[PDB]
Amino acid sequence: SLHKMSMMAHRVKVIPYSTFRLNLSVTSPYNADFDGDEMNLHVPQSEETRAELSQLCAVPLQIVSPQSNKPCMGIVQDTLCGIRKLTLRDTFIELDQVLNMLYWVPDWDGVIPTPAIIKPKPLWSGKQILSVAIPNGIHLQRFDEGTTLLSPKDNGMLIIDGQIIFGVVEKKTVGSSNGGLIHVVTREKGPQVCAKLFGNIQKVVNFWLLHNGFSTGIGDTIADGPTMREITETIAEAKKKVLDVTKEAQANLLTAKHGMTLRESFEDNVVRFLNEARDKAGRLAEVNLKDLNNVKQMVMAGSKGSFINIAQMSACVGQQSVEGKRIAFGFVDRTLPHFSKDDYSPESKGFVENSYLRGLTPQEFFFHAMGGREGLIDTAVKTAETGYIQR
Amino acid sequence: FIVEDDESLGHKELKVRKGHIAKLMATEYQDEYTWSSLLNEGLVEYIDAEEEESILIAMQPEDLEPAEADVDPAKRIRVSHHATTFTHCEIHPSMILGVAASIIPFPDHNQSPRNTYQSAMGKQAMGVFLTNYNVRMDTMANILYYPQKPLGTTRAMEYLKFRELPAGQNAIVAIACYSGY
Amino acid sequence: VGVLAAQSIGEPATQMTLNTFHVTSGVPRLKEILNVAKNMKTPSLTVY
């Protein structure tokens, strides 16, 4: 409990089955997940005790966090991911569903909005219906990259009178962020109105997704037939731009960059070589994954993972490291006994050239472990020393 | 495995041969050539961590040997064997693993820190811890109604009697969004 | 206010790494500071 929000007052709902059932958007405040996590519940006892709990600790009052003067609860996973899809110009819904969708919004005025299309088939677009969740008077303006009052790539975000005008909706427009449509609805309408806003934006979207479906599979992690090649040789060439500066070092044909050791300066380049190599290795695949790649989708929505992730799964895992330097020489002058002494190359110092889709070689597989092992370490040390400093 | 360039018919080469092998799949089929003989003939050596320091170990026995006078665009890119100094070869790399990981499928395809987790949860799944269990008076013990050896396995599982004492079942998974539950 | 700022500060710290890789910064640094250390690891000094 390190937050004002690690404890919040909730409305009780007795339900069956042995478990505390909490809303998703109120997830990050407590910082819980459902892999077994447990929760403590306390019950007020005086008439005021209760009041004190509802007038200052109610979840709705907590939406805007004083520590970072921005909200602290947004739309996570499914609801986020899907709200994105539903927004694209390509997303259209017909009467039968545009109805069952309006029904799920509890506050629905009981009025079906004029179809975004009448000509042959009377259709609607997510942008339209998703908007029925946004209260009147909500004015939002954005502007991303090539964004201008007719956002070509459908960027930015513009909501007037409480109707989405243009742009796609994702983490940026509905996250626990600053401009946050949430941050704005809280400020403009109040704790209550905004608190309800979640459930709605939710109910509509979650429902919709229930029907549009969504998934992920190895297929989302495989690179184009030729791209997987174009990369290989971006590691080969990168390998030689190393063999090259190693030859040019094993000849004393290089000067010491003031303040650094002749040796240190050798690393400083090898490192900056492999890194830039790896950097585009992934970038080749990034642009190689169409607007249908599920993993990409789950990244744009902003509901999980990033570039790095794709990279390490479809291209190159990366360079391994401990204490800041590529896998040491625990064995006198070598990485593993499977190596020739004094091998300063990358295949020895811990550079996993392979992608997860392909699979690590013993050596690669090991170093990788030694690398992760360092990780696990502090996640099991900084865990309580951080708590002291807190205390 | 010991390498010794003992080949008056070529180059460096595993003292062990396909004749020693099938000579084992002989006694193997008998269920007089144990592991005690694989050692009493200088075909395998016990290398402690110290002695390790002064030897050169070859990974794959095959590949890291025959000469060279194209490749598959799928498998993991492998470096080389540019050396003939080798003294020993690796029985099998998938032996650097202990009981835990040995049950993990393609541990060479996951983020290492994850393998490390499953490495722990396994000691917490259900199954059968013995068969005599029906005559055991121990506090707490759980048996999965119906076990199931996995649809995918490690060659190593074979020594972890895992196929006969599974830790789970083969569920018909489906990775997708639905009710949002 | 105090308990507030107290947490507001320590919270975004539980989310950092003990590592000082990738000048002494992060977790150990804050430590260094709150202790009003007389001999920091990286003293260093910038002059314009």
Partner: peptide, 8 residues
């Protein structure tokens, strides 16, 4: 980070 690069 650790398992991607130095700097990372």
């Amino acid at each position: 980070n650790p398992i991607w690069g130095i700097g990372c």
